[PDB]
């Protein structure tokens, strides 16, 4: 095994290092020192530099050095709000709750602060997807009204009777 295993180790190490508040970037040798990878090959080094830490969306390239990407992920209520607004405006769709949960520790506070602004979609497998509440036009009906609408069957009713009814009622 070689050239494919240590990438997971380094990405996990730098993620956990950022979890400790190390916002400052770190050089490759800094991580290599404490990860017991002093015997790492040169071709592994250049392959890492050219592909691994530039293709992933979790590594930021600044002043030549490499750091976390906390801006992309959610860390506050305002970031969640603006991300959801962008999703609603551009129609990109929602986002899984687990991504925000792992990005934002104690994400329930933002959820309960948003309240009705956030919308949840309940999947069969307990997973929840978050949507923005587009308040352009809101209208609601009574439960009795909804039962009345559901009582009337329309899927098993064809297109001849629909236009026969219009002339029957004389509109």
């Amino acid at each position: 095994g070689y050239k494919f295993g240590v990438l997971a180790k380094i990405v996990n190490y730098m993620k956990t290092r950022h979890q400790r508040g190390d916002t400052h970037p770190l050089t490759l040798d800094e991580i290599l020192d404490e990860t017991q990878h002093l015997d790492i090959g040169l071709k592994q080094k250049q392959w890492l530099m050219t592909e691994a830490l530039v293709n992933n969306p979790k590594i930021e390239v600044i002043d030549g050095k490499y750091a976390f990407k906390p801006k992309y992920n959610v860390r506050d209520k305002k970031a969640l709000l603006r991300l959801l607004d962008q999703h609603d405006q551009r129609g990109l769709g929602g986002i899984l709750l687990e991504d925000i949960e792992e990005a934002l520790p104690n994400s329930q506070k933002a959820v309960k602060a948003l309240g009705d602004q956030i919308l949840f979609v309940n999947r069969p497998d307990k997973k929840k997807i978050l949507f923005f509440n587009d308040k352009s036009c809101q209208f609601s009906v009574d439960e009795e009204f909804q039962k009345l609408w559901r009582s009337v069957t329309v899927d098993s009713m064809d297109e001849e009777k629909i236009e026969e009814y219009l002339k029957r009622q004389g509109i």
Partner: protein, 187 residues
């Protein structure tokens, strides 16, 4: 595509139907013709839920689907279903539902009076007013059911008529914007 049709469609989809249908209709508004796999990715729903929603929409016939088949680069057939918004059928079905509810109002008003005014708590079944004479016993001097022989209270049929009458005002108040939007969409 006049904006009045789009506004009316948005109002009816947001008021009568849920957010998923509103999102689907907004997607179809942004692009007139959309392939069945196009609105499958950018919303992050399960395939079965979207299929059920599309089944309901095809049941109410708000949009129309045209069958198209073609070939792929690798040689396998490709079956893409192309969905496009048809406002001509949309306004017709909306008006059909509108007049259906309108006539439902009068049928409910008639049925409120048609409900039986005699109820026996022992058997818990409505008893028609006309046959109350048949249930009445001439030699007893008082009216009772033949099956259970208990006093009948006619006060249990008083409140549903009042409840329906109160809902008439709310229905008539909330239905006006739809008629207001209908007038500008005639042309």
């Amino acid at each position: 595509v006049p904006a009045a049709l789009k506004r009316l469609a948005k109002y009816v989809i947001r008021g009568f139907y849920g957010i998923e249908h509103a999102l689907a209709l907004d997607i179809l508004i942004r692009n007139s013709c959309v392939k069945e796999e196009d609105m499958l990715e950018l919303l992050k729903f399960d395939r079965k839920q979207l299929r059920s929603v599309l089944n309901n929409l095809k049941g109410d016939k708000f949009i129309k689907c045209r069958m198209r088949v073609e070939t792929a680069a690798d040689g396998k057939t490709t079956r893409h279903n192309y969905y496009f918004i048809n406002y001509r059928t949309l306004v017709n079905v909306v008006k059909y539902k509108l007049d259906h509810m309108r006539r439902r109002i009068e049928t409910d008003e008639r049925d409120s009076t048609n409900r039986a005014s005699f109820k026996c708590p022992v058997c818990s079944s409505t008893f028609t007013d006309l046959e109350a004479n048949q249930l009445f016993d001439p030699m007893t001097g008082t009216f009772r059911c033949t099956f259970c022989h208990t006093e009948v209270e006619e006060d249990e049929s008083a409140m549903p008529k009042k409840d329906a009458r109160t809902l008439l005002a709310r229905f008539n108040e909330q239905i006006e914007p739809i008629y207001a939007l209908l007038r500008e969409t005639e042309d």
